[PDB]
């Protein structure tokens, strides 16, 4: 069977309450993508030199990251190994909620996720089952030059090596456990919820906020970081040569405030994106629960203004 959810059919409701995302676990990945149950790979933000060349090391010092998606079983394994209870509606990768949330924003980004309700936990688990160009490298290079590893208590661009935060976040009536890569931390991790100390690093050409493309890009920056409770998004603005010309430190909560003067009528706004997401998540829950556990579904966005949930029979 087929179910549809239309973005524009969502009733005009108040923005759902969203809890402060609470870290329940973290882990690291080695350069060979090996899971490590520690923060050996959490690094610190330190501003890189202005006019750094983001082409340096491409492609000979570049080790492109794994192309295939990771199974969500990993996060479950991690939590099980640590003896952490999982009591939520959803378990997935932050990035897959970003896709649902931002679907109304980029009709060109088509995607497909797999969902199954676990027969023991009753949690809906979501994953993908189906990268190395110069532009991508600019982003990875900016992350590499902007970060300092732990040294006191412990160049090749190897994006496989990373640190990850697993969070509980509630969006209205939906409880989610989300795992996502954290680029670095602003200062020492409170050994206090750590997430507002976390930093996301981005590289972009700078456009005025008048520019629709720029606003949309910022909205997606905001959405991604909002879902993991990240406090800061730091943008390395680059020119067409890939030279770092300016850095801009933003607080995540400031992006919607900063964008307020520039939204044209009928623009998707942070508040509207949250309303639609809550309704999307509620729809997914009710649909999945019309079937026995271990029923596999595909959730698809293939342009237009609808999500499609398909039972795999």
Residues that bind Mg ion (CB under 5 A): 183, 201
Q: How far is the CB of 60 from Mg ion (least distance, A)?
A: 22
Is 188 marked as a binding-site residue? Answer: no
Is 224 marked as a binding-site residue? Answer: yes
Is 183 marked as a binding-site residue? Answer: yes
Is 232 marked as a binding-site residue? Answer: no
Is 181 marked as a binding-site residue? Answer: yes
Q: How far is the CB of 185 from Mg ion (least distance, A)?
A: 13
φ and ψ of 37, to 5 deg: -85, 70
Is 200 marked as a binding-site residue? Answer: yes
Is 129 marked as a binding-site residue? Answer: no
- Confirm if 126 and 92 have CB atoms less than 8 A apart: yes
Residue labelled with tokens 């330190």: 46
Give the residue with the Cβ less far from Mg ion, 144 or 288.
Answer: 144
Give the residue with the Cβ less far from Mg ion, 183 or 278.
Answer: 183
Give the residue with the Cβ less far from Mg ion, 89 or 224.
Answer: 224
Q: How far is the CB of 200 from Mg ion (least distance, A)?
A: 5
Question: Cβ-closest residue to Mg ion?
Answer: 201
User: CA-to-CA distance for 257 and 270, rounded, in angstroms?
Assistant: 10
Q: How far is the CB of 237 from Mg ion (least distance, A)?
A: 14
Give the residue with the Cβ less far from Mg ion, 39 or 183.
Answer: 183
Give the residue with the Cβ less far from Mg ion, 127 or 183.
Answer: 183
φ and ψ of 267, to 5 deg: -70, 145
DSSP for 219-283 reads HHHHHHHHHHT--EEEEEEE-TT-BEEEEEEEETTHHHHHHGGGPPTT---HHHHHHHHHHHHHH
User: CA-to-CA distance for 141 and 62, rounded, in angstroms?
Assistant: 9
Q: How far is the CB of 201 from Mg ion (least distance, A)?
A: 4
Question: Can you say which residues are annotated as belonging to the binding site?
Answer: 33, 93-95, 143, 164, 181, 183, 200-202, 224
Question: Can you say which residues are annotated as belonging to the binding site for a divalent metal cation?
Answer: 143, 183, 200-201
């Amino acid at each position: 069977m087929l179910r549809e959810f239309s973005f524009y059919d969502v009733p005009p409701a108040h923005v759902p309450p969203v809890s402060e995302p609470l870290e329940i676990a973290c882990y690291s990945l080695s350069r060979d993508r090996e899971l490590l149950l520690d923060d050996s790979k959490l690094s610190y933000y330190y501003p890189p030199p202005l006019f750094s060349d983001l082409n340096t090391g491409f492609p000979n010092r570049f080790h492109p990251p794994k192309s295939d998606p990771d199974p969500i079983s990993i996060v479950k394994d991690v939590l099980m190994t640590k003896g952490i209870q999982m009591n939520s509606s959803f378990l997935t990768w932050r990035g897959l909620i970003t896709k649902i949330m931002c679907a109304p924003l980029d009709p060109r980004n088509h995607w497909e996720t797999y969902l199954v309700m676990d027969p023991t936990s009753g949690i809906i688990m979501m994953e993908e089952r189906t990268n190395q160009d110069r532009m991508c490298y600019w982003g990875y290079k900016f992350e590499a030059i902007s970060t300092l590893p732990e040294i006191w208590d412990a160049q090749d661009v190897v994006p496989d090596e990373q640190y990850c935060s697993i969070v509980k976040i509630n969006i209205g009536k939906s409880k989610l456990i989300l795992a996502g890569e954290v680029d670095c931390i602003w200062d020492k991790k409170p050994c206090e919820n750590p997430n507002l100390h976390y930093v996301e690093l981005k590289t972009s050409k700078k456009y005025p906020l008048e520019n629709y493309g720029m606003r949309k890009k910022l909205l997606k920056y905001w959405a991604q970081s909002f879902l993991l409770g990240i406090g800061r998004i730091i943008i390395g603005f680059r020119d067409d040569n890939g030279i770092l010309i300016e850095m801009k430190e933003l607080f995540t909560h400031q992006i919607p405030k900063m964008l307020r003067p520039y939204f044209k009528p009928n623009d998707w706004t942070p508040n509207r994106l949250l309303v639609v997401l809550e309704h999307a998540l509620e729809w997914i829950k009710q649909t999945v629960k019309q079937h026995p556990p271990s029923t596999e579904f595909t959730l698809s966005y293939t342009g237009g203004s609808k999500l499609v949930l398909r039972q795999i029979i």
